[PDB]
């Protein structure tokens, strides 16, 4: 922890990059260790009934911060591999989740209804380098039913790096109640590592963040596992909010805190450096 003044931040990034990124390695190692003396339970994730609801076996949802689905008229119908994550000066500003599976499409859309979510942030392509990363939980055109949630694609705007899909959603068992759900899908994340330039992601962050309507549920952020790119997005968005309000940046302290809310948020040192680049672009661009 301990906030860095924004005017001293780019100088700090210079120091972190020097000597083959020694500073960045030290920071990321401290993030990885911040769990060491902590046992964070994820019993529901490990329950045999819930195992098929997990995309990855080692990517669990911590019990304390996990999003609970309202129970259905069995005991384990409450489970989704999703966790609430804080934003800047706002608890539960996000729902960081995995890329839904065909078997969890109903659970996913029910969570969006129950949580009053109005924005989806998707930072993965369905398939990357021939590998299945996420199943298509939304309709290619027109309408698709996911249990009691009927989803209608109303408009699409395909930018160079990201696609904006405007959906209309309704619950069959609500006396027909309609809600607008906007999906911000980043389409240009490379197969390996992080993007070369931070600016396109910064722009994706700014525009997806600006669409947050008061006073709706948390912003749903997902990639494949719901940790790396998801965590990268959360830190960039929160640190921009921090800059705007206090003119300070605290990547390290904030990341160590959100790491108690969902395992592995910001999975690699490369993502950790990328966060810094996005913020550098925001500071110098100002």
Peptide bond into 215 cis (omega under 30): yes
Closest to 276 in 3D by CA, of 89, 4, 29, 1: 4
Query: Mapped to the 3 state alphabet, what secondary structure does the chain carry?
Result: CCCEEHHHHHHHHHHHHHHHHHHHHHHHHHHHHCCCCCCCCCHHHHCCCCHHHCCCCCCCCCCCCECCCCCCCCCCCCCCCEEEEEECCEEEEEEEECCCCHHHHHHHHHHHHHHCCCEEEECCCCEECCEECCCCCCCCCCEEEECCEEEEEEEEEECCCEEEEEEEEEECCCCCEEEEEEEEEECCCCCCCCCCCCHHHHHHHHHHHHCCCCCCCCEEEECCCCCHHHHHHHHHHHHHHHHHHHCEECHHHHHHHHCCCCCCCCCCHHHHHHHHHHHHHHHHHC
Q: Give the span between the Cα atoms of 179 and 208, in whole angstroms.
A: 18
Q: Give the span between the Cα atoms of 255 and 34, in whole angstroms.
A: 10
191 carries a ligand binding annotation:
yes
SS3 at position 217:
coil
Q: Where are the domains of the chain?
A: 1-286
Count CB-CB contacts under 10 A for residue 34. Answer: 16
118 carries a ligand binding annotation:
no
228 carries a ligand binding annotation:
yes
Q: What are 167's strand-pairing partners?
A: 153, 181
183 carries a ligand binding annotation:
no
Q: Cβ(267)–Cβ(234) under 8 Å?
A: no
SS3 at position 41:
coil
223 carries a ligand binding annotation:
yes
The contacts of residue 188 (CB under 8 Å, 6+ apart) are: 160, 161, 162, 195, 200
Strand 219-222 to strand 90-97: parallel, antiparallel, or no bridges (unpaired)? Answer: parallel
Alpha helices, DSSP H only, in 167-286? 199-210, 228-246, 251-258, 269-285
Q: Using CA atoms in the order 197, 238, 223, 181, what is the torsion angle rounded to 10 degrees?
A: -110
Strand 119-122 to strand 248-249: parallel, antiparallel, or no bridges (unpaired)? Answer: unpaired
Q: Give the span between the Cα atoms of 85 and 241, in whole angstroms.
A: 15
Closest to 183 in 3D by CA, of 270, 124, 245, 106: 124
- Site of tokens 């009927």: 150
Q: Is 223 a catalytic residue?
A: yes
The yes/no answer on whether domain 1-286 falls in CATH 3.90.190.10 is yes
- Site of tokens 């940790």: 227
247 carries a ligand binding annotation:
no
List the structure tokens of 142.
């027109």
The catalytically annotated residue of 6, 80, 101, 223 is 223
Q: Phi, psi at residue 116, to the nearest 5°?
A: 60, 25
Which helix or strand (DSSP H or E) is residue 94 part of? strand 90-97
């Amino acid at each position: 922890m301990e906030a860095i003044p924004v005017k001293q931040f780019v100088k700090h990034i210079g120091e972190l990059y020097s000597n083959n990124q020694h500073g960045f390695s030290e920071d990321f190692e401290e993030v990885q260790r911040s769990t060491a003396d902590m046992n964070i339970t994820a019993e529901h994730s490990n329950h045999p009934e819930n195992k098929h609801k997990n995309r990855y076996i080692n990517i669990l949802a911590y019990d304390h911060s996990r999003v609970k689905l309202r129970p259905l008229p069995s005991k384990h119908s409450d489970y989704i591999n999703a966790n609430y994550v804080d934003g800047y000066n706002k608890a539960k500003a996000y729902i960081a989740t995995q890329g839904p599976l065909k078997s969890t499409f109903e659970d996913f859309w029910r969570m969006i209804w129950e949580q009053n979510t109005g924005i989806i942030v998707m930072i993965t392509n369905l398939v990357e380098k021939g590998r299945r990363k996420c199943d298509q939980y939304w309709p290619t055109e027109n309408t698709e039913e996911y249990g009691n949630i009927i989803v209608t694609l109303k408009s699409t705007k395909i930018h160079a790096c990201y696609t904006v899909r405007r959906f209309s959603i309704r619950n069959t068992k609500v006396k027909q109640n309609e809600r607008v759900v906007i999906q911000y899908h980043y389409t240009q994340w490379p197969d390996m590592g992080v993007p070369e330039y931070a600016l396109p992601v910064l722009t994706f962050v700014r525009r997806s963040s600006a669409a947050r309507m008061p006073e709706t549920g948390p912003v749903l952020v997902h990639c494949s596992a719901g940790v790396g790119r998801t965590g990268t997005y959360i830190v960039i968005d929160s640190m921009l909010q921090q800059i705007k309000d206090k003119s300070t940046v605290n990547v390290l302290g904030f990341l160590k805190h959100i790491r108690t809310q969902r395992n592995y948020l910001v999975q690699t040192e490369e993502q950790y450096i990328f966060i810094h680049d996005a913020l550098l672009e925001a500071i110098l661009g100002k």
